[PDB]
Amino acid sequence: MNTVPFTSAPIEVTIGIDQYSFNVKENQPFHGIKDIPIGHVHVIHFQHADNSSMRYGYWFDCRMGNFYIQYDPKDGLYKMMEERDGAKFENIVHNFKERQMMVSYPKIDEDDTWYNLTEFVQMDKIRKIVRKDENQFSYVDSSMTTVQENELSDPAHSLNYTVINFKSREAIRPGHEMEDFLDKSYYLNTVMLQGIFKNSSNYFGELQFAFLNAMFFGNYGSSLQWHAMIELICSSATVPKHMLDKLDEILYYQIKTLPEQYSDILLNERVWNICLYSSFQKNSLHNTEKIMENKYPELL
């Protein structure tokens, strides 16, 4: 179980850790989060009480270093940093725990939600998408645009997911125009899976990362990414049986976790109705269709 200490909390803020969250008051004696499960990526995120604009946060894996949070009064945000002095860090953490100034990652033992949302998400892959090689953790916020949004503006601060474009030469083989547009199996299996991602685990990892950035930061380009990656699978007539079964599990847990009150802005009516009721895979996502029909029957 690892720890992310905070130097202090000088400004009132709501702090998220994965799917959990808690309020910290201005100058409250808060010094971090303990008992963080090893083996998963994690996200620690922030919304200031005085400007709910710009949610922002950091993806990290405690196996990759000792990380802490410190407020920067010049740039006006809580920054993640790495402590290289391992003895300094252990000393700091132990004192804060002894004084009980830390919240405990509040995982119920029965609960596999975070595993289910991050099963295929790897820190190594997140760092290719979010380019800042000098840090081992990755900053994301509500306003960062994707490479695709930039094509349609700062490149250093962009989300480099693969751009999914169904009306593109990559997606459409010369001479198979109708075939490839109506059945996207070529684009999914040959271009994306064999060509770019290398395997379906990697594809699902980007899919899962995109959803989580959409949900935790309201990042619009990430929401577009998530839906495009779903639609590419549902619009392919030839998809390995194990991919379809895993996709149904992935989406089930995403739909289950989504805040009921954000369904209007995080779910695309067209994509979901197409995927569940018109697409080649309309009958292959039993768990997802059942939770969608019972939780969001309005959208459909």
């Binding site: 009306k167 030469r169 459409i172 125009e177 109708m178 547009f181």
Partner: protein
């Protein structure tokens, strides 16, 4: 974006453009079978691709053999249309290729866009105009070449005959759409108007009769009367 009454004169500027109409591509007769079920028999069709500035009509004849063994023909017909338009564009010298293609039905947008990905600078546009090009097969010489075709074939026409010698392309397009609208609303009556005077003939190299300027004014009035008529006969007014 979409072409409508507000940006109408754009059709007659000096940017090459083509209208594409796919209505008459997939044509069928419906009939009863010996068992008393219903079946369709395809007949030859055509793509109607028109330059509204010059009157050049690229009439690609769609022979019934292209449907053999194929499923979902109404969907296929849109993609076949897009395929043949793309082939036409590729066959033209660069300086004759269109800068825009306007499709008369919105269901042609995605098929044509996908077939034209190689031509990112050619704009594919819909229109809010209700153009009467489905009536092209009421022009006898066009219907004749379509029905006589025994194989795929492209035939070139000028749908304005020699009108541009005397009138502008705006006025020629207006005459064309009035004639086609009439033929679509009451083909028999429209054809009666156009031919009732045997002294006015259709040149071998023309589609419509050799009316004088004054005779076109009369003809055009008779076509408006017909259209307003049928509009009453229809709605009782």
């Amino acid at each position: 974006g979409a072409m409508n009454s507000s940006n109408y004169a754009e059709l007659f500027n000096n940017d090459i453009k083509l209208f594409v109409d796919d209505t008459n591509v997939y044509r069928v007769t419906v009939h009863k079978t010996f068992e008393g079920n219903v079946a369709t028999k395809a007949i030859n069709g055509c793509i109607f691709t028109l330059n509204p500035k010059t009157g050049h009509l690229f009439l690609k004849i769609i022979h019934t053999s292209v449907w053999a063994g194929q499923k979902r023909l109404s969907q296929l017909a849109k993609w076949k249309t897009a395929e043949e338009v793309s082939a036409l564009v590729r066959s033209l010298p660069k300086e004759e290729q269109p800068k825009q293609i306007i499709v008369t039905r919105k269901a042609m947008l995605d098929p044509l866009e996908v077939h034209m990905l190689d031509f990112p600078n050619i704009a594919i546009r819909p229109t809010e105009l209700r153009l009467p090009f489905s009536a092209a097969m009421s022009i006898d010489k066009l219907s004749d070449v379509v029905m006589k075709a025994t194989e795929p074939q492209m035939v070139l026409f000028n749908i304005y005959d020699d009108w541009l010698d005397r009138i502008s392309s705006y006025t020629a397009f207006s005459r064309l759409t009035l004639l086609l609208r009439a033929l679509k609303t009451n083909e028999e009556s429209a054809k009666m108007i156009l031919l009732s005077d045997p002294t006015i003939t259709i040149k071998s190299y023309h589609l419509w009769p050799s009316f004088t300027d004054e005779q076109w004014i009369t003809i055009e009035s008779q076509m408006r009367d017909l259209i307003l008529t049928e509009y009453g006969r229809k709605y009782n007014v």
